[model samples]
Target chain A: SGLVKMSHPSDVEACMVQVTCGSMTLNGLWLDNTVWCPRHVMCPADQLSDPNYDALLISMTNHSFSVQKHIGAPANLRVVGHAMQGTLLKLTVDVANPSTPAYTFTTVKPGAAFSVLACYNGRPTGTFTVVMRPNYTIKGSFLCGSAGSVGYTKEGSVINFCYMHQMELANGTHTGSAFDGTMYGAFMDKQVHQVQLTDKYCSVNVVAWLYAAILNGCAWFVKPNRTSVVSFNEWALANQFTEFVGTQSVDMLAVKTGVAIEQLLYAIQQLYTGFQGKQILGSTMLEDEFTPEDVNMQIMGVVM
Target chain B: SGLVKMSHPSGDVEACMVQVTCGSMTLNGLWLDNTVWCPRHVMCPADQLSDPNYDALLISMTNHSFSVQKHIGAPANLRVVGHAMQGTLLKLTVDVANPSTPAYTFTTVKPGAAFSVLACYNGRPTGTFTVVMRPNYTIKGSFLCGSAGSVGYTKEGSVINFCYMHQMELANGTHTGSAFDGTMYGAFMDKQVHQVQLTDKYCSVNVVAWLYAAILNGCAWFVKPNRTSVVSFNEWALANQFTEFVGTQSVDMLAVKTGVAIEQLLYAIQQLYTGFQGKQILGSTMLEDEFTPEDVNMQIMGV
Candidate 1:
């Protein structure tokens, strides 16, 4: 049996635990663990090679064991994932899926006890969860990341996780390298702590190569029936960020190239599906060191 | 002594005549030959075509001679010739490059007696011309047809004739069975027309066939680099006009497809260089009476 507890013991803030043994009596208690559980847990602020954080341990004892973890924070804090002591319980954290971020606990070889906590951020505002049952089966929020809330209302069935941050810098100066290397790196480093959070965790892998190959293969035979010159003059006026580096209006070819690259990246992300149930190979911590200079240079390269 | 008379009956017009006779003038009077003059010249209304209402005949007594013909509007039109009726006269017309409205005149010919007129529209807004005349050559201008108020200007040099019309319309739309077909057709048309306009005016049988083959071969090779999703999306957009018909806002593969097809077509047009001149194998007048609803539909079918 597994027992789970919440540190900030409030009337509605209690953690629930259940054991599978028949007729096993259950006890619910709240420890005044304020000294043990600080209001804010600070991870490494500087750039570290392999930065990680510890999880909030909710020890349990007593039949057939089960534990569930839920994290609540300000709507802005993009809480990412929850982990048990030293091991990752939920590998992929989808912060924009729901209101209450929850992760269900799986069995710890008979006599094992553990705790869980979540990771989040404010850049992309939302909540996500990883639900694990005693059967060791995992159910994700959705195949793709959740649709993030825009203007306090979430629309669009598939949330473009990669493009969510793109709206922040409306000028579109940020490139794929900047997003993947800098912003994502900073977010992971800032949210994930150095102390090993989970006793055992899972990693999710998404493979898009096959889909890309199929799409590329099909392109060889299909040909359009008619084509017209789309005037870029109007398109440039509508989207001021699309102008070239010299401020001179770009031709239709440049505009089309940019659009194709963006759409290709989005489709690739959506089609990926192989990384599930595997251990997270490595954390993205190197991106935290990206400075303003790096971002500026990247923008220059894209424009040039 | 071979005698000839050359004159502009209208005042404020210049007429120059060069004689190659051994013994010069006996009586070079500016006679108004009624027998060789037009009886009634009908100037059309603003929207109608201009046609002369009378016929005139003039005879030249000398083998080598020259005369200048000019129109007395705000701007002067002139024509110069070597022989009064046989030698070619260059007629320079003016103000035929305006984008909104334009005018033109046939400025030169081999035989002065033969009359030819050309109608052209200005398509480009910015252009200039430089004309040059050599020792045996001369520059002239005159109103062939159309409004007399229209005047054009040009710079002169020796042995060089500069006649330019701004804003020339490129070509008409092409109809092909598919997007690829349309692209190939457009490429061939652009290449042939550009070559003809910039280089030569004659089209050979082999050149026409080669141009078509070049476009088809290029399309076959170029179509391989595109992606499957893009091709599919292009087909959908080609079928559905970028969802404008259905009024859908979803930016799916369909939208991309439409965009890529257009891009590819533009590229094809810009790159194709089939060395062939444009020719009018079939004249427009032949099909004027044969037109029908089905013909109109068929003409625009692939477009």
Candidate 2:
């Protein structure tokens, strides 16, 4: 859609805007009251249009609308809108027009590709309501399921505990099954939407080892390994460790480690028993019932 | 000359007080050796013996009645100091001219000690009541006051041992319950750690004893490694790596383990109950030496 309201062509230099579709990067330009685009940047005719897909725009300069008699004070604009995730906009007051209303827009360098909360001047001020589109709303996830779920966050190299959990939604459908303590590290809450897991693996390992010493007669150890201290980010693949625990089984993992499935299952029983005792890991099956399927589920839930 | 006043001598065994009544009387003082005659004795002025500093224990029969006849021409005034259990500042002065009656004597429930009431009285050998023993808490409180501090304990009701310092002011007198309570308050309130070293024999060991007492009495709290309530000093010692330092119970050993100077260690427990109240952030945590992490942990935990 396009509209042109300019009475003269020179006004194009005074005001302009660039709008682009988030997924296709299809670009369009609005100058003073006219829409312009390069032929190569236009969306292809065969690709169906979806309104849920995000489109973002940034103004080239402060644009004002003034009608002398009726709503007369010229309002300066610094734009923030829904589904704007890829770019950050900052508005600084124009010092020359201090008495009059005027604004200038600039982009902040983004550290993460997608963030639920963004920092302004090194302090967190706002949480983005939607991520272009969401995979699932908070009400559908295991985070709020039955009140046993815990959530956390990661920033720079440090991980912090969180009081609430966040997830994305796709249309009106949930992107995955509820978290049954079978997810580790980063995974998609919705298709193509990744969420980082900031849960402390060291805390998990220390608690597990401490309990295993008492229950499984394993030797007591508390110091965490360097690898266990790391935070997990998302990896992209199809049904391949992409979201939660895929189809990977304990039998397969034991084969990789050169251990029998039975031996590994017994160890998994100890670790899972410890997790269940602490109420950190959740599962629908009975804790004592050590089937290979359930054991594998518990195993995938913990290991990074 | 003696008067045999006993109408019947059969019960002379039942009624006896080795008890010679004091001062210049004409009769010779005697008991049971043919002077079972006079109920009790009265010796003359020439016969008077200087019984200076006499100490005597008065164990009585079921009949709790007692009397005193104070002024019968003794050389000086009769000073009868009565010490009963829980007694403080108790005594009566009978001038040589003023005689005492039953009304003048003390009424006591249990064992009592009198310093100058025994018979042959010029005077007794022991001096006026300089304190002989004191309670545990006041020993620490007095020494912390940094003045003429003295404390003592009695064993076997006769063996008296006292710890005294000449330099510390003795303005705070011997222990009374009210006085000791005020004394302990000022002990913690008035003094700072570096200002005095409570290294006196009585005061030094008693702090460790009282803190140990607080733990046993359930007033003290210590924490285990993962923040569980540590009940016994054994567990507390192990958790804080103070095994070698603890059983020996020396303040200096604690300083070594805690990485604190003697002054800080002394001040460490000054707010023992404050930390016990569990105001961890502003009071317990910041109040201790911050050089060692375990010290701060120990302050918060062991307090």
Candidate 3:
């Protein structure tokens, strides 16, 4: 059995300000937590006219990060629900599944005292920008070239995005020429603390999830049908682990999904070792929870 | 990618013998790693030894070890079957023509070889195989089926040894004997490999510990000796038939209610090996008065 002790780096200092250092400018409508971009900045009228088109962005405020999609037609361009709390913006978006397929208008719900900013060229230039959000610069580095061009990074690309999904969807063209590499272009580091926190948190959660799967008989030596003996296929087992971890946090959307695949294998070995240790001591006490047999029964119950 | 920190018991490990006393019966066997070596027996009821339902014949494998030859009485045909660990079912037809005249229809197993039994069911013995552990602790074996030529032909010092056996049932619900060319059959122990092979025309194939193996309709099966240990089950049919060990801690073999998986079993076997340090004795006379402590210790020192 493979086992290891988890290690992590120290946390970054507090994120006192938002990230703002790009030609692209955004305005937080302060309704339902969405920070909308200007009418013509990233979301053009032609693009907005496309069916199911919406602006998607990532907003970080006070070190709190969220990946949100713009709901509805082209009346507004949006990102995660930051209300007016968003100070930093990541100028990239994609057509991905959302927790809720949703939408919005001006102050649809009770409005909160919020600040809006339309910053361009690292300076605020919009109405109602009385400074409610922190003053952080949207800092980043550009890498590979866009779509049909060969792009290269000064060093090999190192992704520091808080959520792996963003890194997965981040594109060179998302930020235009500024960040143009498909995988090696943009390096968003407005708040490194959150990145580390997300990674560390995810690692812990993924390992726990795997441990629980084994304990509950959802993994390893599982009797999928309950009447006979069967083991989980290694690939399928790891895939399910990925899916479960994905639901815990967006950070896991990255390839590591909290822990690296190798680390997960280590955890597996550790679990096996733990069980072996018990056997050495002549212990045979299987608990009655999350057993594959019970799981199968529950699924059958629901289906019936 | 399955990496883990290595862990083992503290020092003071040594070779030893195992004697399990359950009620009035005491079984003598060898303990080496996770396996408890004992004599597998095809026991007959007091009244008769022949029954078509196979109900009269009982397959018994005591937790402890013993001598197979001493366990069988006089006038009995004996040929040593393959040496296996726990959890194997042996089906055979033994003829008891009056007393002191017992004959195994399909060649008798060698009397003194070490063996273990997992389970037994009603079925005609289509064939039989014998495995002899060489004095140097290497292996040699011959497998024979009804009218079929020897499967492997007698080979000496062959790394190949028989370590596993279970009833092989076809998809058509027919429980076949120790025939080789049907579905899946058994596993072998290899120094470098612990793998399962699945192929067309074959159901299950497994190799463990670089020492023993059994195969059926599967294609090519390979077993290599190495420090690495792994247990793999390929294909759905065989996977369903084979169950590994699964439990929390402190499990009882007799009260076992669930299917025992493979890796868990392997872990136990490994533990037994560590505890016994390879030296073991599985020699005991059938009569309680005839048993000698010196004979047991004498065998242990030699192995």
Candidate 4:
């Protein structure tokens, strides 16, 4: 949902890092292996509305850069924790409920030692932080959207992601149960990647195959819940020749499908009611959440 | 309607037609086509459907229909007798009142609209009000929530509700509440709001009006500590009900319940004091409220 955010400028080089000594050495093309998001990296690349993000500016140089001043980011994500051995680096940290203002985290990892800094401007805020760990096993991942989320794993406590907007809560659920967490704030990135490594390493959370597919705009998955995949190849074929304008919203994506959003929703309701001989007004877990005032598809307006 | 005949292998029958004003219609999605159930015999159950007696009934029904024009079947003409009781609520009795049916009585803070089932006894509908509450003239009358006449009629939903708008309960505690009357709710207004009035307001939320009065007024004999309390109770209570366990043999109770002795029970002809409470010098302590200031030692403890 947004550009990349890094507490350390080196984090980008780290994500885009390449290790090709003998081709068989290790840590091959880092970008394809992991997802790196830096705050304020606007979609359309040049759609930046202001110059304050100048401090987070980046240029490809076998990955070489440094931050001398604090630049405001569109988001408050930072590298709060990162542990690395030879290649796999497990990152850990704290984040606030998603907001317009939160304590921004910035960090720099020169060589192997880890470091991060927290700061603020003013306004409502939710900050996500990152840091490095020296050689550790990462048992989880994180994903988020415009609704608040939290993730914990069946493996113990998984991870969760929630992308909260205006009236959203805590950006998401508490993470510590799911193996992965996702967040798509303004950064509500919608994609899940599953990497299957040898059972001894980690289970299935991140994988380069899904990563490259998502970036190449060829492979995308529409998962029903956190697990099962409903669409992947079907989704690609359905939206053939879909060119990116900016990051399209679900409403915008409906337009691209040549369907009116409301009409499509009406059709879906009709289809389902036909599938079952029942008409649904609506349903909710909490009684207070079902106020008459909130009737549109604004379920996540008060997002996660 | 029983919804008995909306039958078909397909579920379309239910959505196909709905009862309408004075008659029926077939839905065409946008417009409705008037439907006429022509032969009454066809709609009837047994074959013959209309024997001599049925024919006679049908002819009379047709004559009745002609006079009334529209024929929609539903219950009507129920009867209920409402009694105004002193205090906040009015007691109502309803049933087949004209037939001298089983009596069903209810006491609500407000009267209800017609057809509203009032209360259950052996656990079933026995009272359905025929008409809502109405005010009685020639005397200062009191009623509840709503009725046939103006009980200060307002909007449909936010109409005359129970309790005073300026109730002390609005500023319930030293902790919360909005301004009611002139009392602005804040932790600072403690002295003026004796906690008793506000306490009673909330304490009686679920209790009926007179019942609450009966409890508060009638139970004063067992509550007030001294002689006046008993005298006051003698005058106040309609019945003579009194006494209470003071201190805890189990040690949980008495003075601890309401540490001070019941105040009003003391017959107030001289000095109104109710029964004594159990909060005597237990072992080495006297129990009381958790009234402590936050950060008292620069705010260490809290109430």
Candidate 5:
């Protein structure tokens, strides 16, 4: 819905916003004669619609309010709700009458961070609760189940590994179900929504490979002594926790908290021996990691 | 002075190090004498340094007790250590020594020697006796771990052999050797077709390695590639092929494989290398690297 403050209508320029994500796009006009409001500010008859637009609107509005107030000695900005639509950020500032008769204004170009500030007789300000967004979010997916689940297909390394090491959402071993049908949007908490998996595939592949080789296979690890060169082995780390870990090899915790290599081997071994045809792909499944962690660092010592 | 510590064997033991890079390597043995040590020595793990510049291991060593052999025509006594079950890494603490020189004295390499060894008395080697990982090695600490930059390993092999640089950096940068706890390795090895070389000038990752080495190593310069030691160097050169860069086509292979013209890899992948601490070390700015399509079939599932 758009907003209106009953401004006379005779050739008034339509201040508008267009917001876009991947393929979704939106546009909100500044003078819609109806509604315009965000969580923190207000602007000329702006329309408030899609969830995406609301954020851009609020953020841009916040910026604009700060800019205007910082420059002019206006009482304070009565924040107009910033609304976003499509790939556009529609930011409106109060061009209210000022003592100097000159109100500074600004607009955001598409594909750029835009902010407007005002300090006019009738300016607006926020409710002081403008928490900033996190720098960036990690988004990825995997097939069904946790690392310990059955009938599951993919196990996203970054998301699970992040949880296991830091997120503390569930024990690294606490596997979850899928996004219902064959896909999942894995991310650290506090994220509003998920991005398409393609955003982090490159990062995903490398981490998965390292986890496979270093953590799962124990292929490479640091020694208690620095400057010593050592060859890595899958079995070396396959057993109990290696005296060589985290402090040594960084963080190659192959098993979940309190889990042992024996149990993991048993579970993994079963995925093969017990499932037969289901496990036929097991060996290749584990072998794909290292060969991919490089510009050609795959295959040697043993290769096809 | 064979040091009467002579458990003297009749033949020669060929000491080799794979010295692989984040790339590939190969070695066709030319000759060797003394006692034979294989499988055990062959499958040995070693201490590969993250930075020859620093005196710290990415992680402390697992073992230091060693079996010594004052080999035939030895420079300093050969000391070996590291724990390895049949097929694990066998790392021998890298050291160099001098009888005429005290604990700090480093035994220098005779320009044409095949290998160099340093000796020490302190639980491990001092800076003077430390052996640097060849091909090339690095260290780093972004949020404290650049498994790509700094790393060290302790190993063993029946004989001291090739150092495999490509094997792994396992990083030990000033803040290294951890996969997920923050430090980030600059590049990732791809399944690029190295055989897909641009003439002999570049291999699969050569260009990238070159770029990294040039800038990161603080030595961005160029040197020509000799022919591979694959029988190209005449006897005089090959005869003196023991030192760092003397007789073989090793130079050609080293430069070409490690790099000369690395366009460089700007993207990074780390897990907290699954993320660390609490406050988001993996910046959204990292999403900077655009994505490429590849199957996720290779990775493991938590469930």
Candidate 6:
């Protein structure tokens, strides 16, 4: 006989066995009094075969068992319409058994079959198959025939079990009672179209404003002088003459027309005075020139 | 002895040679003149050894002769100053074989040197090397030699030419002479220093104006009612209780500062009206609530 040393018997017992019997007292009066196990101990050893055991163990003991339960629950299930390839569907789950270990799960489409295997103890207890029609609809029920004596019970109930279909749809009819009709309907039909239209209108308005400003500014500046006017006809004789002389004449004309000589002279004097003032206001304007009221006034007087 | 191209007559009396001579000419009606040539006579050799039978012919001959007169003239020489690497001297010489070929020659100084060569070709052919000593000083001269030849002609000439070296000093020095002096000198020495002094004075004025404008603009907007005054202090704390109340109350103190509204009833009316207008114009009152009275007024008055 080997001497066995037990380190914390209750912990060991809890870890190794499923206690089926309950405490009971026998009556002192009769030999006919009998007590039996409180619940059924129906462990079907023959059905605990290779693949079934593997599947059951994976589902019951894997860490993802709670995730699978949530993924398979009815309340957590959702129909996503017009989904792209990488669109994510989130599901929340409440695990009935915190200490019963976790598991992994898988699902297939067409028949939409799903299975959860107990990864820790090498057993499978639940299997279900769903059918989805051509209109992207799903209907299914869960079956738990191999739960053994501890069949689907209070501590083992799967809540919020949902399935994610890994398929993308181009354009199709999606119907379900759980669908949010108004929000998604507006998004798909009207809001996107309105946003695109607004963008296009804004682009056209910006382009038109830019072009109008350029043309107006150009027309404002250039005026023709007598020499330029006479030279304009001779300018067209040669290609070189036409291009260079025409451009120069146009610029000179624009300057004479737009800004007056007296105004220009006054501007030059103001510039010189400002330069002498130690500001050295260069030929170009600086940022402060834009915000300064005095400068703005000068610009307004000249431009007007 | 071969074929005799010309034949001469034989001489009979002792083979005499004839000559012509003229002594005088008469001014009267008579005149004596002689025109003769050597008589054409044939001579035969007395003996075969002497070849006396040989005959000679003399034809009337006209001859032309040409002569060229050549002479060795004086040597043409040249001297120069500033032509040396260190010294300011240059010299040049050209032999004038044919003076008719007038050569107009000029000498350019090396880049850094301040001098030039000016030479003229004429009857008195002159040349001068002018040196620019400074901005104003230029010194120049010409020296050459020549001689004349005749039977008894006097060799009257000028040898030294007009070797006049004149130094004309500039009335004003370089400072007054250059166009750049007055403007640039005034700018660097006077205007710049004056500007430095003016800068501080103007800067102070600018700062005062900036502060005044900033305060005035700030007083027009951005005023918020003191929350502590509304909660802890009494509304009738000051003499102008209404003004104090409006100023101290939890008003959009921006509106109060800008004088947009009065007491409670008008405040509510203005708020409601502005809220409605804001919703209509801006599509929301969210941003309008953040605006100051000045901003609101500007939008409303289209200023």
lDDT of 1 by residue, A16-133 (tens): 1111112221111111210011101222224223434342223222211221232223221122323331211221222333322122212221111111111111111111112121
Count: clashes, candidate 6: 45
Model 3 chain A: weakest 10-residue lDDT segment is A6-15
Model 1 stretches astray by more than 4 angstroms: A1-46, A51-84, A87-103, A107-304, B1-241, B244-303
Candidate 4: tens digits of C-alpha lDDT, residues B14-38: 1111111112211010001121111
Query: What does candidate 3's lDDT look like per residue over B61-145, in tens digits?
Result: 3322222221211222222333333322222121222231111112212212222111211111111222222122222221111
- Put down candidate 6 lDDT per residue, A9-105, tens digits, no spaces: 0100011111111121110000011111111111133332222322332332212211111111112111111111111211122322232222212
Quality class of the docking in candidate 4, CAPRI style: incorrect
Put down candidate 5 lDDT per residue, A1-304, tens digits, no spaces.
0000000110111122222222222222222221121221222223322234344343443434331222123233333444433222334445432322111122211111111110011111100000001111111122211111111011111111011100112111111112121112343222133333222112212222333333223432212232111221243234321222221111222232223333333333232223322211112222111212121111111111
DockQ of each candidate's interface versus the true one?
A: 0.01, 0.01, 0.01, 0.01, 0.01, 0.00
Badly placed stretches (over 4 Å) of model 5 are A1-304, B1-303
Candidate 4 runs further than 4 Å off: A1-161, A164-287, A290-304, B1-188, B191-303
The true-versus-predicted C-alpha distance at residue B40 of model 6, in Å, is: 99
Q: Tell me how candidate 1 scores on lDDT.
A: 0.18
Candidate 2 is scored at a TM of: 0.17
Error in Å for residue B270 of model 2: 46
**Could you give candidate 5's per-residue lDDT for residues B52-139 as a string of tens digits?**
2111221332433333333212323443333332121222333333122111111222111112111111111110101222122122
lDDT of 4: 0.19
Instruction: Grade the docking of candidate 5.
Output: incorrect
> Which segments of candidate 2 are over 4 A away from where they belong?
A1-49, A52-269, A275-304, B1-303
Residues B1-303, model 1: lDDT tens digits: 000011111110011111111122111101111101110111112222122111121232222222222211122212222222211111212222212111222243211111111111111001011111111111111111111111122212111121211111122210110011112111222111332222111111111222222232221232223333334433443443221112112211222323333234223222222211221111110001111112112121211
